[PDB]
Amino acid sequence: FFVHPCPGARGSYRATHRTMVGNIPQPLAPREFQESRGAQFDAVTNMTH
Amino acid sequence: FGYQNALKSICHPRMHNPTQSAQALNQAFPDPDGGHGYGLRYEQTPNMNLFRTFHQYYMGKNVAFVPDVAQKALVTTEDLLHPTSHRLLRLEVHPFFD
């Protein structure tokens, strides 16, 4: 979200879309969760190293 | 209790013919549709040129046909046993035949 200025009237709140998983904010999806998803991604898809 | 006790029933021929299997699978579905028939049989031509086996096929292109067994061997160990899917499970009857 954000705060939308309507200059010359009253404003409101308008809304976008967090596209990818990473756009979820880092306090409530930390990096030590986010690196523990690629390891779950690893041994199911089975890429090579 | 190993397979050497169970060998005297598994080696029986009635574990191994589908004529009975096509009876009961017919007698509940009197006719299902034969859909996007792709790799059901071999076709022979008088061709020897392999471009004739190449340009005559790949020139035009439908929404691509995917057969039954090709989308059997990507479904993982639970999605088969989930009730979202019929057509991957109505056509599996006993695992020796396909």
Add this chain to the structure above:
Amino acid sequence: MAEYEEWHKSPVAAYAASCQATPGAISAMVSMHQKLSAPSFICQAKHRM
């Protein structure tokens, strides 16, 4: 540009500013880019993600 628009928000770049160098951290990044849709989630409740 203006970063209430694009297809990466700041926690994507904020993850980059404090990464490791592990190959598991590489496999988190491919795992990060994923479109969060409702018809995404079928593709990952299939593979237990």
Add this chain to the structure above:
Amino acid sequence: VIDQLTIDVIQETAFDPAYPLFCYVIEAMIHGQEEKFVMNMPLIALVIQTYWVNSGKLAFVNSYHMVRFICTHMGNGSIPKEAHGHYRKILGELIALEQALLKLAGHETVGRTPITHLVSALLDPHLLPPFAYHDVFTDLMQKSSRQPIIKIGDQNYDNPQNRATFINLRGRMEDLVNNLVNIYQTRVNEDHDERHVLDVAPLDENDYNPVLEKLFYYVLMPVCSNGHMCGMGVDYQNVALTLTYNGPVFADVVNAQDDILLHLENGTLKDILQAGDIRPTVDMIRVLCTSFLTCPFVTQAARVITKRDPAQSFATHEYGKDVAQTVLVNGFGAFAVADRSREAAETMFYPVPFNKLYADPLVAATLHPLLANYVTRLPNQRNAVVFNVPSNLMAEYEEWHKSPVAAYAASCQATPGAISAMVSMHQKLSAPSFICQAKHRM
């Protein structure tokens, strides 16, 4: 004997963005002849050395006839010694790869058929190796109680008395010195479609078994390369058009070692010899010129049709009592060609998919532009399993090798235990199979 070091060296060569196209051509030319390898026994010594020193990778992973000649012949001072140490590990472990099928197979027979034809789904001779250079077709009829069908095109082939009409046999080169004009006369005067002239160098019981060819094409190739292979069709008067029509090859005084990169012209000999940076001498391409005479004409597909293993002659249809495979006469397997010389690659080769073990689209994505926008017109077709085969070639519901074999083969590791899983995999699921495992706790 195959260590984890040397599966990786295969996987190093399994993904080659700069594999030399030049040595790939020579593999088509000998096509598995003892007489024709001694022709080019200095050539592969020049290739493998200059491919092992410029980069830490080895040449000619592809076909059994090219590996075995590097292994058996030429174990002396023409190579880098570390390279042969991989090739020694190829055969000497692969000999033990067939020993493990022995001590599960029973010692006893039933009739004329022993159990090793039944339970060992590998060692069964009806698994013809998917490529072939010598005529294994008459081996099946002259032993088996099978009633085979060898479908080429229209007409079938069942009686071995007709082995002079459907199959030609071109033996040694010295024995073909008079009929050399006869062979070339059958090119220009004759169209190569609606043909049924099947040209194969003859068969020897000294030379081949199924199994050593079988374990090399069916297990190791689609597993150590994670399933990235294709079937290659090659046109042949195209080939020596690039080679023989050279200036100094045709020409005068210019001596034995006057290396041909100093004497090229603007044709494709530039754009191919620069891809490997080989310095061949003036002899060693003129030697390749003389190979051309007993070469065959066009890579011909075929189909081999036998009934099911008599465990399980029970079925629904007549055609349900029948499972068939292919054999490619005259061609061989394919690695992905480099982005360099792709303009010269398409002028020589063309891909033909067969089979789950050898229809892998991104390897085929190099060599044809309508294939290059066959993939990107709908992007589902990059899987080996989703890939669509022309129905003139193999339907997926009549073959031993089914869909989840390659689906397994595109997710494996390079682990030496994963090689053992495949040899464990090919096994009958049949009622007289199941006796030979309760006697071993399997």
Add this chain to the structure above:
Amino acid sequence: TYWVNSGKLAFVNSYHMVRFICTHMGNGSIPKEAHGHYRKILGELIALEQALLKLAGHETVGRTPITHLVSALLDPHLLPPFAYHDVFTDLMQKSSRQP
């Protein structure tokens, strides 16, 4: 002259300079130890892509496959942050939008 003067490779930043080196000059004009490091990227960046399509299956929704829609990086609506050949009419031809 850089690999002797360093313990480092050159030309990191762009996909077009790495792809030209991973194809051309596979000889020992550059030192062979440096040759591997370019092949570490693109010789494995294919297998970087290969892991996506075990997730992204085979099905199409309409005339649009799933792989454009879930796997975020396949999406040609998304563009690389540089463009040297005309990616624009590539997007304009095959889309179903008002792009």
Add this chain to the structure above:
Amino acid sequence: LDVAPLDENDYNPVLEKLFYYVLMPVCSNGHMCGMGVDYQNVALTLTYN
């Protein structure tokens, strides 16, 4: 706009993005910049030489 024409053989937009969105922000730890070039200035000094 001055951009060379397309070949479908040459590239894809899926191997190019795995370069610039995965391996680039990890190994740099998110420390790169985009560059402007002025060519008649740039190719000047190699010529007036």
Add this chain to the structure above:
Amino acid sequence: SNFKVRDPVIQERLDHDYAHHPLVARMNTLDQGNMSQAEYLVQKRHYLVFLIAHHYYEAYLRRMGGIQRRDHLQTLRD
């Protein structure tokens, strides 16, 4: 096309570029017959390919005949 392979671009007219050679006149021995003018030179080029392989293989067997005795040991008197 859709029935052959793309042809490899090599420089034309090897006979006009070099003719002082005995196998050049052996190309002239073949006849046109039913072929056109331009299509004659295509199959004339393939016949030259046949002439080279027969020529060098004949010199190859003289090369791989091995060193003999009576012409050798007589020369080894010095």
Add this chain to the structure above:
Amino acid sequence: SNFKVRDPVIQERLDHDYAHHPLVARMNTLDQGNMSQAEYLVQKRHYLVFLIAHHYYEAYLRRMGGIQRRDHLQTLRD
């Protein structure tokens, strides 16, 4: 400034320092028109840059034409 890049300091007057060359007179072919005296020599310098690239690229294609046959094999009689 605020609209261009800082200019690179290279020594002036290449024509006065060296003039015995055919491309020197090709700089004199361009006309002043609306430009001043000092600002003419700026754009006269850029036109010399254009003359060099066209000159060496023409010699480059002669260099990358490859060695031919008929002028070569005749010389290989000795």
